[PDB]
Amino acid sequence: RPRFSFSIAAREGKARTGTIEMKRGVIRTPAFMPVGTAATVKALKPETVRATGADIILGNTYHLMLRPGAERIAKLGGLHSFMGWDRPILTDSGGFQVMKQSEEGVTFKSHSRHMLSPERSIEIQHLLGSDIVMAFDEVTPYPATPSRAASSMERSMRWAKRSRDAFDSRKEQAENAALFGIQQGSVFENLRQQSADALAEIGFDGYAVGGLAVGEGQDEMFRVLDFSVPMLPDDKPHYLMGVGKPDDIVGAVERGIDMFDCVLPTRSGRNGQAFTWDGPINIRNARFSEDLKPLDSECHCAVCQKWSRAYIHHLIRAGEILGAMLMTEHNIAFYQQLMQKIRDSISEGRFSQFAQDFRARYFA
Amino acid sequence: RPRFSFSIAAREGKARTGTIEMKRGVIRTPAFMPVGTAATVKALKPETVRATGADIILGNTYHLMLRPGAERIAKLGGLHSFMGWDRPILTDSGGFQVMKQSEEGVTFKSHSRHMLSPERSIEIQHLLGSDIVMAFDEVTPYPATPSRAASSMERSMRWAKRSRDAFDSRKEQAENAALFGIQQGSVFENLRQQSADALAEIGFDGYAVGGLAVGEGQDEMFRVLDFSVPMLPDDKPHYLMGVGKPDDIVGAVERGIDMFDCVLPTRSGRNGQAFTWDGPINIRNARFSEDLKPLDSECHCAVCQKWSRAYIHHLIRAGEILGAMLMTEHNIAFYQQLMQKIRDSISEGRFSQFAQDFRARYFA
Ligand SMILES: NCc1c[nH]c2nc(N)[nH]c(=O)c12
Ligand SMILES: NCc1c[nH]c2nc(N)[nH]c(=O)c12
Numbered sequence A, B: 001r002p003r004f005s006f007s008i009a010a011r012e013g014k015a016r017t018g019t020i021e022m023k024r025g026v027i028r029t030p031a032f033m034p035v036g037t038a039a040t041v042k043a044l045k046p047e048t049v050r051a052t053g054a055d056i057i058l059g060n061t062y063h064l065m066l067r068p069g070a071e072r073i074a075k076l077g078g079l080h081s082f083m084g085w086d087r088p089i090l091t092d093s094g095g096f097q098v099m100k101q102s103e104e105g106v107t108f109k110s111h112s113r114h115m116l117s118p119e120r121s122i123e124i125q126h127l128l129g130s131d132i133v134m135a136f137d138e139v140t141p142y143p144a145t146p147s148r149a150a151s152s153m154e155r156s157m158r159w160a161k162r163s164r165d166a167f168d169s170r171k172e173q174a175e176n177a178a179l180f181g182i183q184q185g186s187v188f189e190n191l192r193q194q195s196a197d198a199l200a201e202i203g204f205d206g207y208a209v210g211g212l213a214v215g216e217g218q219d220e221m222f223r224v225l226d227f228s229v230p231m232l233p234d235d236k237p238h239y240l241m242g243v244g245k246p247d248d249i250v251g252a253v254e255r256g257i258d259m260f261d262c263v264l265p266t267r268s269g270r271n272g273q274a275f276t277w278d279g280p281i282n283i284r285n286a287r288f289s290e291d292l293k294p295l296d297s298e299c300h301c302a303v304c305q306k307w308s309r310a311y312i313h314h315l316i317r318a319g320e321i322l323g324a325m326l327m328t329e330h331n332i333a334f335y336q337q338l339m340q341k342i343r344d345s346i347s348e349g350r351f352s353q354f355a356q357d358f359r360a361r362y363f364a
């Protein structure tokens, strides 16, 4: 396999399906990336993560630098070796978790004093041995005034160039990993356009839509995606960071997004929320205490093959670790089955029908 | 397979190795039973418990009756079905967790008001669908005066007869499960003898040594085992309840014990303690932060095949669920490997040498 090759196999409207080939493996798109905060996808062995269908996972630069430490992970052979996941890993840059500041970067106290900058973020991602490296950005909160959105976007573009140069100057990283740029601009079309133009001029292997799902509603997010995604190079992956709910994902794919990550299936799994084709349920609810059905009636995951709602209800009620394990495996598997249905439907030219059918049932 | 058949294949001094055959499977002895407190061996799927080598697990009557409830489990098809473990399950009777009281039984408040008695304990164990049912006893704390030890022992023997009759009166239970009696008498030889005689007169499928590992030291426990185990019928299994550490197990086998359970490998696994052939280690210790070796250098478990001390150190430090999962799997696997080495050495007539070698290295 090459360092990086994105190929689009089929299209339907703005939606695409295809593959990213990298040295450590192939990623089928549209893709969902489980989040492995501090070198673990919570409550799952890597083999279980793979068994659910994941092709790639996400690691958080900010958290890993705080514990166990980036240099330590490098000394131990890199993140893949450390955690036992040998397929691609994407690392975020830390901009989201950040949100003293200056044009040079940021200093902050560990929740010890730490520093992030375009150069240091790229370095940490190198030390981790990331396959997909993200530019270091400044993420403005919502709502943002046009002036402040413009300032953070402009700084992010200067930082995107610094990220590009840092990545390129490190031969081993440049030859073996990929670098994605991050579009900013809040909800403003003109700023989103300026940001897309700046990133395309610099040139990246992929383009993330940053700064969404930070407090604007789905309607607004979709409105911004409507104009923002077409601004990005068509022939590279489009990554919507930190999204999201199943319906968010479907609508974002309809608008040209190829990659997703979110803590929702894992975090809310531990909390008792299980995804089903008829919408989410909270397994802690008393109505499930004697329900012998699986979490979802169609799901092919090992959890739905083997255990009842009643059992998982008890485990979560009781605070048992196995409850977190089973909920998380099911939810991640559900997400991967959603992505597979999306990929197949686009391939077969029936994605619009799938989206309609999905919504009708999920929100019944 | 029969309802119950214990066969002794080989002996060395007081030590024995053999098999218990039951309808749901064969149990190799000496046996270690992982404890599954409230219908789960903490942090492990049942398939993982089996993969470590366990032939049987223990469930706690007291806890299960409180949550999710015995009647509820019965309605859902029994404990095996509920938790997904299809091999034998032994249930304790509740006497240990108990320790208003009367000759009829005990009432207590949930940590709702609940009741236990010989009849109710046997009933709960039936509702759970237990394969090995334990008589309901009264467990005196250590130290005990001779008078109080005698009173609790005598009550326990009356309760053993009530347990026997309750079990026998329930045809489905009598035909498909086994019933073990529990010897009491604290540290007193005469009381232990009276208790053994009473239990043998009633007749049970197996005999537990109760009331030890409740505050007396290993020396005292071993002294009591020295005279107590030979009092029990030789041709039935001997079960030392709530023991214990690897060295406890080895010494108890040397004294004629066939079955063990304890929370130690699971509970202390979650706390950071890993068993090794060179003694226990606490993985949280800073000395392990960059140690690339497996938990134990010889252990054949999947954890030792795949992850380093450094990684598990980080997980436990961070409070990650995967840390509990990996520690627990390793510790249970270690215990099963200990039992296998014990069984093989007795079979081969070299158990005394094994015990000496084990101690020399474990305590080096
Ligand atoms: N939802 C927005 C988001 C999530 N993670 C992120 N990481 C970075 N660097 N930038 C961003 O805008 C975001
Ligand atoms: N270590 C003693 C012990 C553990 N569990 C027990 N359960 C019962 N019923 N009786 C006992 O004596 C014990």
Ligand SMILES: [Zn+2]
Pocket (backbone or CB within 6 Å): A295, A296, A299, A300, A301, A302, A303, A304, A305, A330, A331, A333, A334
């Ligand atoms: Zn499922």
Ligand SMILES: [Zn+2]
Pocket (backbone or CB within 6 Å): B295, B296, B299, B300, B301, B302, B303, B304, B305, B330, B331, B333, B334
């Ligand atoms: Zn091991």
